[PDB]
RNA sequence: UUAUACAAUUAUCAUAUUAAAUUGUUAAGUGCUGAUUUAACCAAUAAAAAUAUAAAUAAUUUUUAUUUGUUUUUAAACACCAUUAGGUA
RNA sequence: AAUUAAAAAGCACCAAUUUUUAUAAUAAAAAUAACGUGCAGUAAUUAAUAUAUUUAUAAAAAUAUAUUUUUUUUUUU
């Protein structure tokens, strides 16, 4: 669970990087 | 053609689950982490 | 005693406000062109008196100009200070007790 | 071989005009419809034309045709179509003229069905015997008036109730309470007193002013 | 349902799938004549209470597990629109799809109120109001 | 020709299927229609 | 050449399935019968022209459900937003 | 370390169009496309759908009803 803590830390550009949009991600 | 679409469905399901884990390792490689 | 009420009704009929309120429907030559202009593509609102009607067949059963539903009680609850209750008892639909 | 009727019609056209028909009549042409007016501002009040409208009285789709097999052809042997008719008297407001509603059949071959349409005629009764409700048998005749070319040949069924109501001094039929409206606007009946007609007039004229404000559109 | 020909075809079509012995169908003039023509061609084993003016039972015919009547359809497939067959239509129904058709039985009612199949309709050069087909 | 039907005619409508471009649908439909076809001798024996 | 438009969705032309139900003030039950409980007194309401082949034989009406208005010592209460008291319904 | 296609869907960006005006002079100037998303996230967060109302977190959030979701130890005309 320690790796998911840095997901709110990355910049918005290379955040969703295998997909172009962030709307159709898992929420 | 749908059997190859089910294979794409399971791979996209595997990467959508561990998207937050993989996003950190790409950000450390691309040097984009706000300390 | 009935001469006072009959003369009052006859003078209420010939008043200019009653004849202006119960004007007939405006024709297409009076509204304007053949159409296309909003607000002037139809006639205006026509008000009739149910005891002395200036049109024959006050109600109708057409698809779009259907007006029997608008004669029921509740549409005359908007103006009860100006209302005439004998005309309400004689000409209204779905009145309560 | 047995030739059809189209061979006889082609023979008639050849004997009349010298030739049957100039060929290449189809031409496979794309009829393009271009729009000129605004979206909802066509200059008409009922029918707003926005497509290629076909023109033709019997060359259109879905196809109609007169159906000559009905009650009138079963009863009367006619010298020509529309000579004898049988209908009902619906209006006697004019002197010596009975309004007779009659029916005919029009056939749709696509759906394979016949439907009954209604035509109103003005017939002549000199002695004023036709009452509203009589099943009458009318026949063609000369021109009597501008719209009278029929006459009541026989009263096949008299309305006894209408005659007994006319003996009572009442109307032949009680008049209907519904009919044609005067506008598309909902004709509201005014229930107001002698003193409260001015404020009702002000509300009506203010509603007419709002309907005229609808000309401005937005804002 | 809609017309007695329609439910007369419907009850037989539903009871031949359920492998029943008797179907109670309502008897009209055009119904019992169609049933008699079906009995003549061998599609119906028999009848019960055939003189009843209200309803009669059709004893169905079976041979080696499956039913004799395969497809039974009314002419008024909507239940509303009826048809008038010319003798040209009867000769079309006798020679349909380029063969000679004594297999599929098309039944009509003539102007003399006699219910006949298409073979006797071509034989005496008449037509009628078409009721139903069955094979 | 695989059944030997030289005097025959067949028409397939695939528009009500989910995948009309599937190749098994046409052969499945022809085999299901030929399977449901009764011969003249079978009908004549069933009628008598 | 569809003279056929597979399901579910995007959207417009739209009859509330009723003796197991709806309404009851001048009739009943009533703390709004549904907490218990597949079962609720009484009153009004189940059918009633010809025709089934007949080419529309029929009507242009209603709302049992949700919001919103209609009145101010004019709901005591209960519930809700400003925090303990006002208003709101 | 399991099962998973039985189709959940079409304030800005993109020129089918639309808006404004001339007071003894009477249409050529300006502006605006149509439509659908839209970084709005986490806490191993979070029932869903439909209708209506209120708030600029509006691609959102809240309130008031209805319907559905139970995996068998409760019921069976």
Within 8 A by CB and 6+ apart from E114, the residues are E33
In chain E, which residues touch D (CB < 8 A)?
81, 83
Q: Is the distance between the Cβ of A4 and the closest atom of strand H smaller than 7 Å? A: yes
Contacts with D, C 12-71, CB within 8 Å: 12, 15, 17-18, 20-22, 24-25, 28, 33-50, 55-62, 64-68, 70-71
Say if CB B4 and CB A13 are below 8 A apart. no
DSSP code, position F17: S
CB atoms within 10 A of CB C86: 11
Expressed in Å, this structure's resolution amounts to 3.3
Within 8 A by CB and 6+ apart from D152, the residues are D98, D100, D123, D124, D125, D130, D136, D137, D138
Strand H positions within 7 A of protein Cβ atoms = 4-6, 17-20, 37-45
Please tell me which of the candidates A4, A11, A16 has its beta carbon nearest to residue B32.
A11
* Closest approach of D117 to chain C, Cα-based (Å): 19
Within 8 A by CB and 6+ apart from E65, the residues are none
Q: Is the distance between the Cβ of A10 and the closest atom of strand H smaller than 7 Å? A: no
CB contact under 8 A, E68 and F46: yes
| Cα gap D44→D42, rounded to integer Å | 6
CB contact under 8 A, A3 and B21: yes
Give the residue carrying structure tokens 């019960």. E48
Q: Is C54 exposed, middle or buried (0-12, 13-18, 19+ CB in 10 A)?
A: middle
For this PDB entry, the determination method is cryo-EM
Say if CB D56 and CB D70 are below 8 A apart. no
The DSSP element (H or E) to which D205 belongs, if any, is helix D197-213
Angle, CA F22 vertex, CA F21 and CA F28 arms, to 5°: 125
CB of D191 within 8 Å of any CB in chain C? yes
Greatest CA separation for chain B: 47
* Residue F21 tokens, joined: 């471009």
* Residue D65 tokens, joined: 């045709």
Helix (H, G, I), strand (E, B) or coil at D121: strand
Q: How far is CA D212 from CA C83, D57, D205, D215, in A?
A: 27, 40, 10, 6
Within 8 A by CB and 6+ apart from D177, the residues are C57, C58, C59
CB contact under 8 A, F47 and E135: no
Closest residue of chain E to D109, computed from CA coordinates:
E83
Peptide bond before D62: cis, by omega within 30 degrees of 0? Answer: yes
Residues in chain D with CB shorter than 8 Å from the CB of E75 are: none
* Residue D73: closest CA among D61, D85, D64, D88: D85
């Amino acid at each position: 669970r320690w790796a998911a803590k840095f997901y709110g830390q990355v910049t918005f550009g290379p955040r969703n990087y295998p997909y172009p949009s962030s709307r159709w991600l898992a929420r | 053609k749908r059997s190859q679409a089910k294979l794409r469905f399971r791979i996209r399901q595997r990467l959508l689950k561990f998207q937050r884990q993989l996003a950190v390792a790409n950000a450390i490689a691309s040097r984009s982490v706000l300390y | 005693d009935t001469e006072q009420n009959l003369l009052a009704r006859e003078q209420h009929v010939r008043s200019p406000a009653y004849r202006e309120l119960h004007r007939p429907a405006l024709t297409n030559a009076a509204m304007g062109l053949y159409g296309g202009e909003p607000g002037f593509e139809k006639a205006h609102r026509v008000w009739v008196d149910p005891d002395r009607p200036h049109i024959k067949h006050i109600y109708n059963q057409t698809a779009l100009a259907r007006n029997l539903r608008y004669a029921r009680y509740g549409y005359f609850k908007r103006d009860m200070h100006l209302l005439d209750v004998d005309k309400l008892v004689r000409h209204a639909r779905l009145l309560p007790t | 071989p047995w030739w059809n009727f189209q061979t006889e019609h082609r023979q008639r056209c050849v004997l009349m005009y010298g030739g049957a028909r100039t060929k290449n009549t189809h031409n496979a042409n794309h009829r393009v419809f271009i729009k000129k007016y605004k979206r909802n501002a066509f200059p008409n009040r009922t029918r707003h034309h926005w497509a290629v409208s076909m023109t033709g009285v019997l060359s259109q789709r879905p196809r109609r045709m007169p159906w000559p097999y009905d009650l009138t052809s079963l009863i009367f042997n006619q010298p020509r179509q529309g000579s004898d008719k049988i209908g009902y008297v619906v209006g006697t407001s004019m002197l010596k003229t009975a309004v007779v509603a009659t029916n005919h059949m029009v056939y749709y071959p696509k759906f394979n069905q016949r439907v009954s349409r209604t035509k109103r005629f003005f017939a002549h009764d000199e002695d004023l015997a036709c009452v509203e409700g009589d099943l009458v048998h009318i026949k063609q005749c000369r021109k009597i008036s501008k719209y009278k070319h029929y006459y009541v040949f026989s009263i096949l069924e008299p309305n006894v109730e209408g005659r007994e109501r006319l003996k009572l001094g009442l109307k032949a039929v009680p008049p209907p309470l519904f009919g044609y409206p005067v506008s598309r606007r909902i004709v509201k009946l005014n229930l107001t007193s002698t003193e409260g007609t001015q404020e009702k007039l002000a509300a009506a004229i203010q509603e007419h002013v709002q309907d005229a404000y609808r000309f401005s559109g937005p804002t | 349902l809609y017309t007695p020909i329609y439910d007369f075809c419907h009850r037989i079509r539903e009871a031949t799938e359920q492998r029943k012995r008797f179907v109670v169908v309502p008897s009209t003039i055009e119904t019992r004549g169609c049933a008699r023509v079906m009995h003549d061609h061998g599609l119906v084993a028999g009848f019960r209470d055939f003189h009843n003016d209200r309803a009669f039972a059709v004893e169905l015919k079976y041979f080696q597990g499956d039913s004799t009547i395969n497809v039974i359809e009314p002419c008024s497939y909507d239940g509303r629109t009826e048809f008038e067959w010319s003798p040209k239509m009867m000769r079309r129904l006798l020679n349909t799809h380029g063969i000679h058709n004594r297999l599929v039985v098309y039944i009509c009612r003539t102007a003399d109120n006699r219910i006949i199949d298409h073979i006797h309709a071509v034989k005496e050069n008449i037509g009628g109001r078409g009721l139903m087909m069955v094979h | 020709c695989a059944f030997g039907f030289q005097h025959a005619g067949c028409r397939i409508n695939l528009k009500a299927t989910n995948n009309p471009k599937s190749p098994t649908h046409t052969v499945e439909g022809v085999f299901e229609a030929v399977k449901a076809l009764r011969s003249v001798s079978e009908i004549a024996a069933s009628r008598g």
